[PDB]
Design a binder for this molecule. Structure first.
Ligand SMILES: CC(=O)N[C@@H]1[C@@H](O)[C@H](O[C@@H]2O[C@H](CO)[C@H](O)[C@H](O)[C@H]2O)[C@@H](CO)O[C@@H]1O
Ligand SMILES: CC(=O)N[C@@H]1[C@@H](O)[C@H](O[C@@H]2O[C@H](CO)[C@H](O)[C@H](O)[C@H]2O)[C@@H](CO)O[C@@H]1O
Lengths: 133, 133
């Protein structure tokens, strides 16, 4: 596992900027956001070649330990062995994810979180900077 | 009640930079670094008016729950209600703390830690960025 942070107290409208290094041999990487490891408003999982996906971003929620319905994006501005950065903001209805190519997308806030208190990176994403505004 | 981070994997010679907002009414604030909450290589506790001290940085270690011998610094470049940044590095002999105004001091590495994996802020220091360099 990578860096895990708790008591983040990220509130609607605030921008979370996360930048890190993707491992050279990575098949995917993960950044998880939510209340705790069972309760994710955003599982952000760029897949290079994993679980049947090549160069696709897969996003999901997790509620009480159960995965929701995945969403897949149309762009893939990530490479193994390079710096990856994401910017995330939310309100109680949706998260908005901004990627390093400037592409923005929405993901529904299925847990109706009023605050994001938990962030976790996997072992393929080495956090170099996190800014909570 | 502030940000807690784990799996930092900060190794000797690496630098950790932490920037946060000191609460307007703070009597002190705390940044703790170590293996875990009971084993701290550095309790960094700038005190405005707390525990008998006035405008003094108190540093200590904690070993299996037990506080060590306090060290007090001679300088105090902090104010309640303002942003503060500290940078920390270590080696086998000492941690080095660099303060906002450029001042540096050493604190002994009493636990003989070879990595720092845990960090926590108290509720008077609202962390805004963390960088690893
Ligand atoms: C096309 C499709 O539905 N594929 C899914 C896989 O994505 C899924 O893999 C898991 O997906 C979750 C997120 O939803 C995590 O990323 C987890 O690590 C993956 O293993 C598998 C297993 O649920 O089911 C389908 O194949
Ligand atoms: C002036 C003097 O000696 N004061 C000390 C306090 O520093 C001390 O408080 C604790 O100090 C530790 C770090 O060593 C933590 O900051 C802890 O939160 C404080 O309560 C108290 C208790 O040992 O003793 C004197 O008052």
């Amino acid at each position: 596992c990578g860096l895990v942070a708790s008591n983040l107290n990220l509130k609607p409208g605030e921008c979370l900027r996360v930048r890190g290094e993707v491992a050279p041999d990575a098949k995917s990487f993960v950044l998880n956001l939510g209340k705790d490891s069972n309760n994710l408003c955003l599982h952000f999982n760029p897949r290079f070649n994993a679980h049947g996906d090549a160069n696709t971003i897969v996003c999901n929620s997790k509620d009480g330990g159960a995965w929701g319905t995945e969403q897949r994006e149309a762009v893939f501005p990530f490479q193994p062995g390079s710096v990856a950065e994401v910017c995330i903001t939310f309100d109680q209805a949706n998260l908005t994810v901004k990627l390093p190519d400037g592409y923005e997308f929405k993901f529904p806030n299925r847990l109706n979180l009023e605050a994001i208190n938990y962030m976790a990176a996997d072992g393929d994403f080495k956090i170099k900077c996190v800014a909570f505004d």
